[PDB]
């Protein structure tokens, strides 16, 4: 159980981040979710968490902004208690499709602020209370695009790979505090549609082709990702740290 633990899932307002929040809630956690451009969708997830019988808080955070992150975490600490479980799920530039030389510097810059500096801000905010409490779980969200590359996705491949480096440094700083830090290296996820997964911003016939590159010949359910995350977030995962764990249904193997 994650009973008596408080979770912050950045990008909790919808997609996979929402299923992360509900999964952490179902397993006993009280959960905060962020919203940026969807603070209303965040509040609605918080009400789904409350309907499960847990405490919840929707806060409005652009994770690139250290003032909004710090204010948000301090708000969680007052209302729920210090963050025990951090999920850096918020991402920009998930489905860009532009060669590097046609990629706009301001798109690159935003992707790096959200995907890297977002994780840096949130980790900096929560880790002092995790150390003080001698317990912590930080889960960073990477992609096989980060470990295998992706044509037309220079910022996403850079930021998702960068998060593995960040994971390993933070695993080192946190180790002697029972703070683990791990990266989930995601394949592709389905669910009901765009509300559940950014995969649906990819043209259906390109998705069918990516699915045929998975050994399981199907995109993952959001739950198949959230359940790995929930195990890593448990006390029982105390000797797993600094790993890049692939949740990709064989997308990263030599599939025919």
Ligand X SMILES: NC(=O)c1ccc[n+]([C@@H]2O[C@H](COP(=O)([O-])OP(=O)(O)OC[C@H]3O[C@@H](n4cnc5c(N)ncnc54)[C@H](OP(=O)(O)O)[C@@H]3O)[C@@H](O)[C@H]2O)c1
Cα→Cα distances 229→168, 175, 184, Å: 17, 19, 8
The 10 Å CB-count burial string (b at 16+, else e) for 78-95 is eebebbbbbbbbbbbbbe
Give the residue with the Cβ less far from a second copy, 170 or 211: 170
Give the residue with the Cβ less far from ligand X, 46 or 94: 94
Instruction: Report in angstroms how near the CB of residue 176 gets to a second copy at its nearest.
Output: 10
Give the residue with the Cβ less far from a second copy, 24 or 164: 164
Query: Which stretch, 25-33, 87-95, 163-171, 225-233, contacts a second copy (CB under 8 A)?
Result: 163-171
- Interface with ligand X (CB under 6 A), residue total 32
Which residues 40-79 are close enough to bind ligand X by CB under 6 A? 41, 61-64
Q: Is 157 in the site for a second copy (CB under 8 A)?
A: yes
Q: Is 242 in the site for a second copy (CB under 8 A)?
A: yes
Residue with tokens 């150390």, as numbered in its chain: 131
- Interface with a second copy (CB under 8 A), residue total 46
Give Cβ neighbours of residue 147 (< 8 Å, ≥ 6 apart): 160, 161, 164, 185, 244, 252
Cα→Cα distances 78→11, 39, 71, 123, Å: 21, 19, 11, 18
Q: Which does 81 bind (CB under 5 to 8 A by kind): a second copy, ligand X, none?
A: none
Give Cβ neighbours of residue 196 (< 8 Å, ≥ 6 apart): 14, 15, 16, 18, 19, 189, 190, 222
Query: Which stretch, 16-24, 79-87, 146-154, 248-256, contacts a second copy (CB under 8 A)?
Result: 146-154
For the window 187-216, what string marks contact with ligand X as x by the rule CB under 6 A? -xx-------xxx-----------------
- What would you measure as the largest C-alpha separation in the chain, in angstroms? 53
- Residue with the CB atom nearest ligand X in the bound state: 15
Q: How far from chain centre, in Å, is Cα 16?
A: 8
Query: Which stretch, 17-25, 82-90, 171-179, 194-202, contacts a second copy (CB under 8 A)?
Result: 171-179
Cα→Cα distances 36→21, 56, 63, 74, Å: 16, 17, 8, 17
Give the closest residue to 66 by CA, choosing from 128, 125, 131: 125
Give the residue with the Cβ less far from a second copy, 51 or 148: 148
Q: Is 182 in the site for a second copy (CB under 8 A)?
A: no
Give the residue with the Cβ less far from ligand X, 26 or 143: 143
Residues 127, 123: Cα–Cα separation, whole Å: 6
Known catalytic residue at 177: no
Active-site residue numbers? 156
Contact residues for ligand X, defined by CB under 6 A:
10-11, 13-17, 34-38, 41, 61-64, 89-92, 94, 114, 118, 141, 143, 186, 188-189, 197-199
């Amino acid at each position: 159980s994650l009973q008596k633990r408080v979770a912050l899932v950045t990008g909790g307002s919808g997609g996979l981040g929402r299923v992360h929040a509900l999964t952490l809630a179902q397993n006993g956690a009280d959960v905060a979710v962020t919203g940026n451009r969807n603070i209303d969708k965040a509040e609605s997830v918080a009400n789904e968490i409350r309907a499960l019988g847990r405490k919840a808080l929707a806060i409005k955070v652009d994770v690139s902004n250290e003032d909004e992150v710090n204010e948000g975490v301090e708000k969680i600490k007052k209302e729920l208690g210090s963050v025990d479980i951090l999920v850096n799920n918020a991402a920009s530039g998930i489905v860009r499709a532009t060669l590097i030389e046609k990629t706009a510097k301001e798109d690159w810059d935003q992707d790096l602020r959200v995907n890297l500096t977002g994780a840096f801000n949130c980790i900096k905010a929560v880790i002092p209370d995790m150390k003080k409490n001698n317990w912590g779980r930080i889960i960073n969200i990477s992609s096989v695009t980060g470990t295998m590359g992706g044509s037309g996705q220079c910022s996403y491949a850079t930021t998702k790979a960068g998060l593995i480096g960040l994971t390993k440094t933070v695993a080192l700083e946190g180790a002697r505090y029972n703070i683990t830090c791990n990266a989930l290296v995601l394949g592709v996820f389905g669910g009901r549609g765009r509300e559940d997964s950014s995969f649906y911003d990819v043209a259906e016939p390109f998705r069918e082709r990516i699915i045929k590159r998975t050994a399981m010949r199907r995109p993952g359910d959001p739950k198949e990702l959230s359940n790995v995350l929930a195990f890593l977030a448990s006390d029982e995962a105390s000797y797993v740290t600094g790993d890049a764990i692939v949740v990709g249904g064989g997308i990263d193997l030599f599939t025919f």
